Structures are given as structure tokens and as C-alpha cells.
Amino acid sequence: FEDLRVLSF
Amino acid sequence: IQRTPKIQVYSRHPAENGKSNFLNCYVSGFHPSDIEVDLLKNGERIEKVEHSDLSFSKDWSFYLLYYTEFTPTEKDEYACRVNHVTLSQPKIVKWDRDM
Amino acid sequence: GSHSMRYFYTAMSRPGRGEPRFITVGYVDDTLFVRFDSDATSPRKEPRAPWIEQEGPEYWDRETQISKTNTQTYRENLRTALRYYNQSEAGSHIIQRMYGCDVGPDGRLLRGYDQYAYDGKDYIALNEDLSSWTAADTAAQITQRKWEAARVAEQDRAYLEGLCVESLRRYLENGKETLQRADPPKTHVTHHPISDHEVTLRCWALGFYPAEITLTWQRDGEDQTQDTELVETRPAGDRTFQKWAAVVVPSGEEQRYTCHVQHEGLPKPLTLRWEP
């Protein structure tokens, strides 16, 4: 299962 | 900074003349990811060669497996031809059943 | 034994040839189990191993959505990196990510990872403490300050200690007949003269899984590291791996050399010789 949290550089 | 591919050409099982097998060309340790790989039978390009899903190692370098079903013989010569931005001309590595 | 789960992202700009391509591959040890490719007609996470196929439609929807969102985020990341390195819009660039976790035989966390690269060089990485970052340079320090203000490390630590470990426990059980089966190497030693007074002894290991193996030559029991030719471990294409190690020895002295093989699939390490 991937981590669903995302924030760009 | 760019890394030139390592190349190995070999069979899935130890070669036996007349018995069906797979001819593999493993390209690894390269960067960037674009690469051109051909499998050759007596200097000619083998059609419909398949490849693995592009992946990369711990050091960020990429690797791919190119492969085709084949029946080795004493006389038929096999090789792999690789091109990449780090190479000024395509590199040909011959298949040696002992390597 | 011990196991890993890893996701690998590649985002590669291609000026003049459309928008940047985004690919994800997921592995358990040396087994690919999922893939996503933004260039597909219907971009979606696809199963690549039978034990993940059994996952319901809610799994595929969640996994596909994460990757579709990542395609857009990583196109933004590529524009940000171009700006932080003062680069022109003309060249092709690549961002890579590798994240996941290692677990021991008891299923507990050994360590987690969340690493990023730009053009094949380190950019930013979560430290082993799962609470601080190593930025490679002043460009990556900008992302570090942004991620510190947003408490990204704390979120990564929760994922790595929780869902990462739990999904690896689930996958290892559902795929136990393959993922937890170590196939030992089939071995043999070949002999090839190189001159009238020297010969090559090549020790082969074929058909093994996982890729991890140790192949060494000894002369009377002493390691021959600097005089051994090794090839990189290579995939056979049927899940298994191959490797060989070769030494050049005096003709008539072949029986002084032993090839030593260690692999998880073997009941005991092997000690082999050339069999004339």
C-alpha cells in the first residue's frame, strides 16, 4: 500500500 | 553526470544445441534512462523482442532485461547491440555460452 | 527471513515530446507486484503478481488515484527543480524517489526510507531516525525547510512504522508460497585452459531466489578476492537469478581451489571443486 500523503518540492 | 550501461548477454538455462531457451541481454548501472537495445541473430535484428519494466537500483542507476525465445545451435551467432547517450556508437556484446 | 517493500518513482521531462512521463513500480524483495505508467491509454495501477490480484476494487481505486495525483505533483516538482538549479527549459531531467521499509523475521520494522534524486544525484532523503532530513545542497534545503514547516517527516514516520510494515505482513502471507520460498542456487564448476600452463575455473550459481548470494573462491582455504573475476548478479527472466565467479589457476593445481556458496535456500553453505 502506498502512502497517500503528498506535498511538492 | 551520466553513467554508461553495463551489458551482459546470456541464456535463461545452460545452452544445449537444439533445445528451446531464452536469450537475455541485461543492461544496468546506466543514467539517464533512455536506452536502445537490440538482440542479434547472425548480425540481424531479432523482431518482437520483449523487455522488463524499467526499474532502478539503490545508487539510482537504471536496469532492464531484454529477452526472446530461441533455439541455440553450434553455428548460429547471437549478440546484443546497445546504444545510450554515453556511447558515441552502438556497443555489440557477443553471446558466449560459457559467460 | 528478512524482507523489504519498496516503491520506485521516475518522473522524466522530454521537451518537445509531451508532458513528463511518470512511472511507479512496487516490489516485495526482488518481486515486482504493481506498476503505473502515465503514458498508458488508461493510466492505472496494474497487478504484476498473482497474490496482489486478489485485492478488491477499493485497493485499485486508491492506488490508481495516488499515482494519478503523483503524475501531476511530479510535473510540478520537475518545474521547481529546474528553477532551483537555474536550468533552461530545453533539456530533459529526471526526478526519482525510492521509499519503503525493511522488516525482520518477526515482521517488525528494521528501518524505513524516503529518498529523492534529481538527474541521478541525491536531492533530499529522510534520515534513518525518521525525524530529520539530509538535503544535498542549497536547492534541496529549500524543499527541506518547506517539509520541516509542514511536518512531513512525522507523517513519513507514521506511514513507515504503520501501514508500510502492515502491508508487507499482509503481502508476505498472501504470497507466502513464492515470497517466502528461497530457491537455492544450482551449481557447477567449468574448466577452460587459457595457455599451456594456466586454466580458468568458473563457479556458477543459477536458479536462485532472492538475488542475494555470496560466491567466493579459496586457495587452500584463503580468500582470493583481488584475483577473482565476478559478474554482477543477473535476472534469468523466470524470477530467478544467476552469478559466476572465476579464478585463473596453474594447470595441475585445480584441486587446491574451492568455490564457496552461501544462499538462504541452501540447507548448508556449499564447498565445491572442479570435477574432472
Author numbering:
A (entry chain C): 1 to 9
B (entry chain B): 1 to 99
C (entry chain A): 1 to 276
What does the publication say?
Our previous work identified NP338 as an immunodominant CD8+ T cell epitope in individuals expressing HLA-B3739. Our conservation analysis of the NP338 viral peptides across vaccine and circulating IAV strains, including pH1N1, H5N1, and H7N9, found 16 natural variants of NP338 peptide, with the most common mutations occurring at position (P) 5, 6, and 7 of the peptide. To understand the molecular basis of cross-reactive TCRαβ recognition, we solved the structure of NP338 and its variants bound to the HLA-B37 molecule, as well as the structure of a cross-reactive TCR in complex with HLA-B37-NP338. Thus our data demonstrate that CD8+ T cell cross-reactivity in the context of NP338 peptide and its variants is favored by similar conformations adopted by the epitopes.
We first refolded the NP338 peptide with HLA-B37, HLA-B18, and HLA-B44 molecules and assessed the stability of each peptide–HLA (pHLA) complex. We used HLA-B*44:05 molecule as the refold yield was higher for this allomorph than for the HLA-B*44:02/03. The NP338 peptide could bind each of the three HLA molecules (HLA-B37, -B18, and -B*44:05); however, the stability of HLA-B37-NP338 was superior by 6 °C to HLA-B18-NP338 and by 14 °C to HLA-B*44:05-NP338. We then solved the binary structures of the NP338 peptide presented by HLA-B37, HLA-B18, and HLA-B44. Comparison of the HLA-B37-NP338 with HLA-B18-NP338 and HLA-B44-NP338 complexes show an overall similar HLA-binding cleft, with a root mean square deviation (r.m.s.d.) of 0.2 and 0.4 Å, respectively. Similar to the HLA-B37-NP338 structure, the NP338 peptide was anchored to HLA-B18 and HLA-B44 by P2-Glu and P9-Phe. However, the NP338 peptide adopted a strikingly distinct conformation when bound to HLA-B37 as compared with HLA-B18 (r.m.s.d. of the peptide 1.7 Å) and HLA-B44 (r.m.s.d. of 1.8 Å for the peptide). In HLA-B44, P5-Arg was fully exposed to the solvent. Owing to the presence of four tyrosine residues (9, 74, 99, 116) in the cleft of HLA-B44 located underneath P5-Arg, Arg cannot be accommodated inside the cleft and adopt a different conformation from the one observed in HLA-B37, that only shares Tyr74. The structures also demonstrated that only HLA-B37, and not HLA-B18 nor HLA-B44, binds the NP338 with a secondary anchor residue (P5-Arg), revealing the hydrophobic surface of the NP338 peptide, which might help cross-reactivity. This hydrophobic surface of the NP338 was disrupted when the peptide was presented by HLA-B44 or HLA-B18 molecules, which exposed the charged P5-Arg, and for which no T cell recognition was observed.
